[PDB]
């Protein structure tokens, strides 16, 4: 047995020099045992123990060197001092008992601290790197726990650091990479050029391969680029060798075919499937459940029958039993075979590797593929379920019932019919509770009153004040609703059925009394229970008051622009808003880097095609991963030729301040640097409402009358609208028209006579007669109810 006490006293054994390595070791062992089994104790005593133990250390008694390692080893994230050895670690360090040296460092590292961290370091560097593979291994492990704590101390070393990871032992080679699990956690790019290194060389450890796979895979999901050759390359690689695991590993993800890859891969897979198909890799079971997914394609499915038939047949191997349920499921089944199986199952399920659990899982799947649906099956199943039984169905029922509800099943009359009956003579009060509750809600939306009543009475029939009680409670939702005959009678019934038995009496009385207390109708009720989208933005913007004009928003942006490209530290997405008077660019964001918070932020814009520039606004502070707002404001000139479409030049200014995210500091100092700000271009669709005309005929002409500018091109290398078309529907954001829009994948002639209204109120109108002689020569008209738009449309459309 275990107990601390003998040992502390026994520490006086330390006092002897005549000792045998055995004798002491055992004593040492005894303490360790209590602990291996489990012990808990005071530090003071531990400390003491150390001292006591520590005390002994003249020798190199090798054995002695190990035990302590253990002992020490026992302490690592919940320690007591560090310093004591120190010398001893060094002593190894100059000292060639190679062996020993390695264990000791390793413990320290969960226990570690930064100053002390300082210690090893030149050497350490060496040490990780040093000699025989053995020693090196010892070194490695040590960090990791320190990585818990941190490990960055290490980290730093890195450009330089990795390269040594270059290996010549398999075991080792495998190992190097995980540390690279975290290395790749740190970096993706690095991998990529890296891979070409991993990719570059054929590998040693099956083990090494594996991490890569996950990774490799991980990469693949969205696509790991043109895996074609790599994937392929890999594909061999996974595919064959003398180490099975890889082939399989690859296999389970890789399918690809809903009308997709199936080529080589299905055969190879088959070689495997079959090969596995009797517990080579008892692994095979899991896969079918998802890892290697199945829900088939139609001829494909027919082919599957044989393999599943082997498992189905075999009935053995825990790995087998599971396999039977998934394979059968995934591939699906005919009715008929089920029948054979039901009998098989009849024996099987109880224990046949403890079939019941796999089966409950299987069952959970059954309830799902048919959760009261193929009700005939549901009933066949139901009969069978209850029947094959044991008892273990109940658990299943919890799921099954749930499934039926999920559908909100409709062959309830029948479904319910089976349930009702069987449950009656399939017992368990507990089920009733659940079902009651559900039923409780449902009532007269599904009618069949007499039956349902018929049932209900029965349910009550059973004793239990409690059993009885549910029929009344369910009823409240029901009663209230009434059904194909109920209200009159509903009133009659509570009367007809009535009970004593005191608290059972009371239940009748009380419900009544309760009933007594409200107008039963009431009773039931209580108990039972422009100036666009963009304008909104004009207002949203409005809470600020530094304005220099606004108006009401007319239309907003046809496209928000990320003003800082992808996943940048100062990630910007920008949205632009037009009002009848001003345009505001309000800037949406995630000052990205946790490096930074940007401060003293304002936004420069500098313009080419007019706007009067009132102000650049910036956000006061922007910390990491959190929108803040900065704005830039303009007033929109409307009656000029060239005056609201503009590109503005952006430069971000800030005083850049570093962060501690743990607990920061926010101080007046910090220094600016400025980074380029992306262009803003302003559109002819941030401003416009596309329309249909108040008066096309007239308007159409009219707009010409006052307004009209023209451009002609004659098209001699291409006889297609389409280029033009890409620029026009899309740039203007207006409607192509006069039933003069439509073109199939070809068409002889086309007119878009097109619409919307521009900001500042007045309209911008376009007629594009595209004419095909067989060259295209074309008349583009822009006509407008605003001056700035006719010149604009012709440009803007591009």
């Amino acid at each position: 047995h275990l107990e601390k006490s003998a040992v502390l006293q026994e520490a006086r054994v330390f006092n002897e020099t005549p000792i045998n390595p055995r004798k002491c070791a055992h004593i040492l062992t005894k303490i360790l045992y209590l602990i291996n089994q489990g012990e808990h104790l005071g530090t003071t005593e531990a400390t003491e123990a150390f001292f006591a133990m520590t005390k002994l250390f003249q020798s190199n008694d090798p054995t002695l060197r190990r035990m302590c390692y253990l002992t020490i080893k026992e302490m690592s994230c919940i320690a007591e001092d560090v310093i004591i050895v120190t010398s001893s670690l060094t002593k190894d360090m100059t000292g060639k008992e190679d062996n020993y040296r390695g264990p000791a460092v390793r413990a320290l590292c969960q226990i570690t601290d930064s100053t002390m961290l300082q210690a090893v370091e030149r050497y350490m560097k060496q040490a990780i790197v040093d000699k025989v593979p053995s020693v090196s291994s010892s070194a490695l492990v040590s960090s990791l726990h320190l990585l818990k704590c941190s490990f960055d101390v290490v980290k730093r070393w890195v450009n330089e650091a990795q390269e040594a990871a270059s290996s010549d032992n398999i075991m080792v080679q495998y190992h190097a990479l995980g540390l690279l699990y975290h290395v790749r956690k740190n970096d993706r790019l690095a991998v990529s050029k890296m891979i070409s290194k991993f990719t570059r060389h054929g590998l040693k450890s099956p083990f090494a391969y594996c991490m890569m796979i996950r990774v490799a895979s991980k990469q693949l999901e969205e696509e790991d680029g043109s895996r074609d050759s790599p994937l392929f390359d890999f594909i061999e690689s996974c595919l064959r060798n003398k180490h099975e695991m890889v082939v399989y590993e690859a296999a389970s993800a890789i399918v690809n075919l809903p009308g997709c890859s199936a080529k080589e891969l299905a055969p190879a897979v088959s070689v495997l499937q079959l090969f596995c198909s009797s517990p080579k890799a008892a692994l095979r079971y899991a896969a079918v459940r998802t890892l290697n997914k199945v829900a088939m394609k139609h001829p494909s499915a027919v082919t599957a029958c044989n393999l599943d038939l082997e498992n189905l047949v075999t009935d053995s191997n825990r790995s087998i039993a599971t396999l039977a349920i998934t394979t059968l499921l995934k591939t699906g089944s005919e009715s008929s075979i089920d029948r054979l199986m039901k009998q098989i199952s009849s024996f099987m399920s109880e224990i046949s590797d403890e079939f019941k659990v796999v089966v409950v899982q299987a069952i959970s799947a059954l309830c799902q593929k048919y959760p009261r649906k193929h009700a005939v099956l549901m009933n066949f199943l139901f009969t069978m379920l209850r029947e094959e039984g044991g008892f273990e169905y109940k658990r299943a029922i919890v799921d099954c019932i749930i499934s039926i509800i999920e559908e909100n099943s409709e062959s309830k009359e029948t479904g319910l019919s089976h349930l009702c009956e069987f449950i009656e003579d399939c017992e368990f009060t507990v089920l009733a509770t659940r079902i009651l509750h559900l039923l409780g809600q449902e009532g007269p939306k599904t009618n069949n009153p007499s039956k349902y009543i018929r049932f209900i009475y029965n349910r009550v029939v059973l004793e239990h004040e409690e059993v009885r009680a549910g029929a009344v409670s369910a009823l409240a939702k029901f009663g209230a609703q009434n059904e194909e005959m109920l209200p009159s009678i509903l009133v009659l019934l509570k009367r007809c059925v009535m009970d004593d038995d005191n608290e059972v009496r009371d239940r009748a009385t009380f419900y009544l009394n309760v009933l007594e207390q409200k107008q039963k109708a009431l009773n039931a009720g209580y108990i039972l229970n422009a100036a666009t989208r963009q304008e909104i933005f004009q207002e949203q913007l409005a809470a600020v008051p530094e304005f220099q004009g606004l108006g009401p928003l007319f239309k907003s942006s046809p496209e928000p622009v990320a003003l800082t490209e992808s996943e940048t530290e100062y990630v910007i997405r920008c949205t632009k808003h037009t009002f009848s008077d001003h345009l505001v660019f309000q800037f949406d964001c995630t000052n990205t880097l946790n490096d930074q918070t940007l401060e003293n932020v304002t936004v420069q814009m500098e313009p080419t095609e007019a706007y009067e520039v009132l102000s650049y606004v910036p956000a006061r502070s922007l910390p990491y991963n959190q929108p803040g707002t900065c704005y830039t404001l303009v007033a929109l000139p409307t009656e000029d030729p060239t005056a609201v479409a503009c590109t503005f030049s952006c430069v971000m200014k800030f005083t850049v301040k570093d962060c501690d995210p743990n607990t920061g500091e926010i101080d007046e100092e910090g220094y600016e640097d400025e980074y380029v700000l992306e262009d803003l271009e302003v559109t002819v669709a941030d401003h416009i409402q596309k329309v249909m005309k108040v008066n096309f005929e007239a308007a159409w002409d009219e707009v010409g009358d006052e307004f009209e500018k023209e451009e002609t091109f004659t098209l001699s290398t291409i006889k297609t609208l389409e280029e033009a078309v890409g620029n026009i529907v899309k740039f203007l954001g207006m409607h192509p028209c006069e039933r003069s829009d439509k073109v199939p994948e070809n068409k002889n002639t086309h007119t878009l006579l097109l619409a919307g209204v521009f900001r500042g109120g007045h309209d911008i109108l376009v007629r594009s007669r595209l004419l095909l002689l067989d060259t295209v020569t074309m008349q583009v008209t822009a006509r407008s109810s605003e001056e700035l738009p006719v010149d604009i449309i012709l440009a803007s459309v591009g």
Binding site: E421, D425, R454, M485, L493, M498, E503
Partner: protein, 349 residues
């Protein structure tokens, strides 16, 4: 207030399991005295600490359920004169002090703390007459024979709870002559376990006769045998469930209402339906009828049949009622369900 104080004290004293909301309701009454006679917000605060405590505990997690809450009214229940009072209660749904006390009380927290601390001419015609216990054999052997033709042989036997027991001795088949041959059977003994009878019987070819009849019987059924018998209902229910569950047959279909129909069936089997609740075997009823009977060799058989019942465009001209049959052997029991099934209707046997 005396009562209130007592309640609080006892509650404090206990704690170790229960269930009542219903009780809460029980003390309260439609109205009742509470507080001085009113202390308004403070009184709202009063309701809040005493009730909250009950609740705090309530809010906490569970083992076996005690009862899933349906305290909807519970809510009004906590919050011209009568009308005014109601309004006040709705609004709610010294005072400051009460609130503070309630907060302090807030009892899952307490429980958690405790846990932490712990841590041929001759023509013979025959049929059976069973006349009162005694199944008696009418035999006509009519020997329209040309003489007391020699007759064969007959053998005795143990039977079921009966034994056959008589033979008129001679063996002549007297000429052109008619005879009554009587067999009494012994109706309380001879076990033979060849169920439903249907046991082979011999009349032998043993003398002016080359053959004869060897017969097994059929015609031996239950519906008759059992007599009605009776029970206390609570105990009954308990029992009903308790009994040999193992047989059931369904009622569904006939020619009549279960008034006349039920009566008919009842009389036919000579058996009991134990008790009515007037709920109403008329307007519908939506009645499940419990029946009990005890037989001649003493089996008690239990039924709950639950049945729709005739009535215009309401329900019953089928049933789809289930007849649940309990009789010790399933084999007779189910068979009984059948037997009754035969009994149920009236048609060409």
């Amino acid at each position: 207030e005396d009562i209130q104080s007592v309640m609080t004290e006892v509650r404090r004293s206990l704690g170790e399991i229960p269930i009542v909301e219903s009780e809460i309701k029980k003390e309260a009454g439609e109205l009742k005295p509470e507080e001085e006679i009113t202390v308004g917000p403070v009184q709202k605060l009063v309701t809040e600490m005493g009730t909250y405590a009950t609740q705090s505990a309530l809010s906490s997690s569970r083992p076996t359920k005690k009862e899933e809450d349906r305290p909807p009214l519970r809510g009004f229940l906590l919050d011209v004169a009568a009308s005014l009072a109601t309004t006040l209660t709705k609004i709610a749904l010294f005072v400051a002090e009460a609130m503070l006390l309630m907060a302090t009380i807030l009892d899952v927290d307490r429980i958690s703390l405790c846990l932490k601390v712990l841590s041929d001419p001759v023509y013979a015609e025959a049929y059976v007459h069973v006349n009162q216990y005694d199944i008696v054999l009418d035999v006509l052997v009519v020997n329209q024979t040309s003489d007391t033709l020699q007759n064969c042989t007959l053998e005795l036997a143990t039977l079921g709870d009966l034994k056959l027991v008589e033979k008129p001795s001679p063996l002549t088949l007297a000429p052109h002559d008619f005879a009554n041959i009587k067999a009494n059977v012994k109706v309380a003994s001879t076990e033979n376990g060849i169920i439903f009878g249907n046991i082979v019987y011999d009349v032998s070819g043993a003398a002016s006769d080359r053959n004869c009849v060897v017969l097994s019987d059929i015609h031996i059924d239950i519906m008759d045998y059992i007599q009605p018998a009776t029970c206390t209902d609570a105990e009954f229910r308990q029992m009903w469930a308790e009994f040999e569950w193992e047989n059931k047959v369904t009622v569904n279909t006939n020619m009549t209402d279960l008034n006349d129909y039920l009566q008919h069936i009842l009389k036919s089997t000579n058996m009991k339906c134990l008790t009515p609740e007037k709920a109403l075997s008329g307007y519908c009823g939506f009645m499940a009828a419990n029946l009990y009977a005890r037989s001649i060799f003493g089996e008690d058989a239990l039924a709950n049949v639950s049945i729709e019942k005739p009535v215009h465009q309401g329900p019953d001209a089928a049933v789809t009622g289930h007849i649940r049959i309990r009789a010790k052997s399933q084999g007779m029991a189910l068979s009984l369900g059948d037997k009754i099934n035969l009994s149920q209707k009236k048609t060409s046997l």
